[PDB]
Design a protein around this nucleic acid. Structure first.
Ligand SMILES: [Mg+2]
Ligand SMILES: [Mg+2]
Ligand SMILES: [Mg+2]
Ligand SMILES: [Mg+2]
Ligand SMILES: [Mg+2]
Ligand SMILES: [Mg+2]
Ligand SMILES: [Mg+2]
Ligand SMILES: [Mg+2]
Ligand SMILES: [Mg+2]
Ligand SMILES: [Mg+2]
Ligand SMILES: [Mg+2]
Ligand SMILES: [Mg+2]
Ligand SMILES: [Mg+2]
Ligand SMILES: [Mg+2]
Ligand SMILES: [Mg+2]
Ligand SMILES: [Mg+2]
Ligand SMILES: [Mg+2]
Ligand SMILES: [Mg+2]
Ligand SMILES: [Zn+2]
Lengths: 82, 66, 177, 115
RNA sequence: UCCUCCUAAAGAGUAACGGAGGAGCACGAAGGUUGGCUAAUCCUGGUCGGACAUCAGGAGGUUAGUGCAAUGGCAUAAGCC
RNA sequence: ACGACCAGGGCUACACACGUGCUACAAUGGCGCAUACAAAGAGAAGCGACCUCGCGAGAGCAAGCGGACCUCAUAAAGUGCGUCGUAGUCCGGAUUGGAGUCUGCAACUCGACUCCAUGAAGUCGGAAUCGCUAGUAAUCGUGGAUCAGAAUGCCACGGUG
């Protein structure tokens, strides 16, 4: 975890983009190459698409996810089984 | 009821620590207490306690703000 | 006899009101309490039969029935006439003095107790229920159980439907849900 | 002896004996016996009875056997049923906190197991 | 050599290298009598209990059983204590 | 383009096998209290004592030092008094959940650390094999290099012997 007294992390290029994209409403999936942001409560109910290493993977974000960071719904290396 | 082959049956006190004095016949012999009394038991006042879900907005805005 | 002193005087005063009845016969009545604690594992020792014929006898004061297997199954190592089951039946006032020890003491005593679910009436109001362990009837010494094996209380009553037989037990605040 | 859900052995001391509950170790086990006015080398036997009558009051203000197991196995199922990375490392049966699994993941992977 | 149904033509009987099956024992009760009781099977509920152990009603009514082959019997049971 | 800049992944995946090490399987030992004796190093974007807040990692304030001056720094094994009584154990700490601290643009894949829970596997280890001839093997702690944070290995010095 972070130190608390610095506050949570989020990029500016996703914070300003998400405050624009709430107030323009469109569920065209917002893509991002920034998989290290703490998801904020006013990001509840959005379809973003985080990079995983190859392409974006879409993530529809609910109330339950808002503690975590955007990486933990993009599993990185593929695995099927030997 | 056959007269012999069934065991003993005598009245014994079964009090609880919350104050439910009672008498019941059994074969236990000794005075037997009680821990849990269903006249104040946590089933009608104490099974809310587990749910512990919480809004994630609440776990967010309990520790800091913006 | 205490719950039956409660019953005939202060249950009909609700079960005559809420269900539009003419006589005192139309209300359901309890019939019998049966206690099956079957030992399906007594082929390796006869002691596991007779101890399971004593460990529920010490709960409610009757010597029980060593009931036998009815027909034959090749799979579970049974034939006609293997004593595998143990049964107690209670009627009348001993039914009430056991129902007291169930619903006053042995119902909250069970580990992780969170009520007993609202559908066990087999469509005719005749109840069924099942404990998982014996010491929750508090009439046993602690370290004097050879194994742990539950029984199943079955309250056969003169209930007629699932809607109309449940309220009898719920009049004794049966911890449903 | 019968304290807070399940029994407690009597021959052991108070501090080592109270750890038989699910959810007390050697910190809450001295919190109880210093917020209820008991010593620490008297047994469950040769106590009095009112000491248990207030020890049972002290213990049940925490979360104990029912509540702990339901909360822990609630949070595990919650972490499973989103897609979280701890969720996938739960529902594959592999170590979660970033262990090396080229060898030595055996505590999650059970036994040593040929093909 | 003996036993059961069919061919056998509505009574008995009626054959072939014709069509199918069982016996050459058991039981000190599995016998006499008195008293009492009633099934196979599936649905539903239930401690480990599963499609099939035991327990509860409940449908249904010999579709079950006879120490063994079939055939004929069998509730007054000749079935089961 | 086999050149060059940038964000995000990757070397850390795992059905398995081998090699090297650490911690144990306990009484010559766990835990709690008091009590003595070392050596060799390092430090200015650094080492950071005293004092206060915190259960604890540590944030708060600000002296001291280019150092036989000041710091890091308390040695641990031991000795004395308790407790423990052969148990998967007050043995062992694996794995998992909840809450936190610090360096750092940033600890999700992947950081160390402290508290509250959880308490697996293991009762001296098969064939075969490894090191050592005196301050040696066996156990005990401390420092350094690389380093914003991050070694149970590496390189050093002593304590019992
Ligand atoms: Mg605990
Ligand atoms: Mg602990
Ligand atoms: Mg004829
Ligand atoms: Mg016969
Ligand atoms: Mg069924
Ligand atoms: Mg007869
Ligand atoms: Mg790069
Ligand atoms: Mg590598
Ligand atoms: Mg190996
Ligand atoms: Mg000690
Ligand atoms: Mg340094
Ligand atoms: Mg302080
Ligand atoms: Mg320990
Ligand atoms: Mg802990
Ligand atoms: Mg073992
Ligand atoms: Mg031993
Ligand atoms: Mg370093
Ligand atoms: Mg040395
Ligand atoms: Zn109480």
């Amino acid at each position: 975890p972070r130190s608390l007294k610095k506050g949570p992390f989020i990029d500016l290029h996703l914070l300003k983009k998400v405050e624009k994209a709430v107030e323009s409403g469109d569920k065209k999936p917002l893509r991002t190459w920034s998989r290290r942001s703490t998801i904020f409560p006013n990001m509840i109910g959005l379809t973003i698409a985080v990079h995983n290493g190859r392409q974006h993977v879409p993530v529809f974000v609910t109330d339950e996810m808002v503690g975590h960071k955007l990486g933990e719904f993009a599993p990185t290396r593929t695995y099927r089984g030997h | 009821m056959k007269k012999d082959i069934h065991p003993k049956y005598e009245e014994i006190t079964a009090s609880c620590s919350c104050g439910n004095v009672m008498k019941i016949r059994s074969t236990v012999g000794h005075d037997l207490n009680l821990d849990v009394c269903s006249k104040c038991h946590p089933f009608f006042t104490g099974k809310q306690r587990d749910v512990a879900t919480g809004g994630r907005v609440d776990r967010f805005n309990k520790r800091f703000n913006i | 006899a205490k719950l039956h002193d409660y019953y005939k005087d202060e249950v009909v005063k609700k079960l005559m009101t809420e269900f539009n009845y003419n006589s005192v016969m139309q209300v359901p009545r309890v019939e019998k309490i049966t206690l099956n604690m079957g030992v399906g594992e007594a082929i390796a020792d006869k002691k596991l039969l007779d101890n399971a014929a004593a460990d529920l006898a010490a709960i409610s004061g009757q010597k029980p029935l060593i009931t036998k297997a009815r027909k034959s199954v090749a799979g579970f190592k049974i034939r006609q006439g293997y004593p595998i089951g143990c049964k107690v039946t209670l009627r009348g006032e001993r039914m009430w003095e056991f129902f007291e020890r169930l619903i006053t003491i042995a119902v909250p005593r069970i580990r992780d107790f969170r009520g007993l679910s609202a559908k066990s009436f087999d469509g005719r109001g005749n109840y069924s229920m099942g404990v998982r362990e014996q010491i929750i009837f508090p009439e046993i010494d602690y370290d004097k159980v050879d194994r742990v094996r539950g029984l199943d209380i079955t309250i056969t009553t003169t209930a007629k439907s699932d809607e109309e037989g449940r309220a009898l037990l719920a009049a004794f605040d049966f911890p449903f849900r | 002896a019968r304290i807070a859900g399940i029994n407690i052995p009597d021959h052991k001391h108070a501090v080592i004996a109270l750890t038989s509950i699910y959810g007390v170790g050697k910190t809450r086990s001295k919190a109880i016996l210093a917020a209820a006015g008991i010593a620490e080398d008297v047994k469950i036997s040769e106590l009095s009875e009112g000491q248990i009558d207030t020890l049972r009051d002290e213990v049940a203000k925490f979360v104990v056997e029912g509540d702990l197991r339901r909360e822990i196995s609630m949070s595990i199922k919650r972490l499973m049923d989103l897609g979280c990375y701890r969720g996938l490392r739960h529902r594959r049966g592999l170590p979660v906190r970033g262990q090396r699994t080229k060898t030595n993941a055996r505590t999650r992977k059970g036994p040593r197991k040929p093909i």
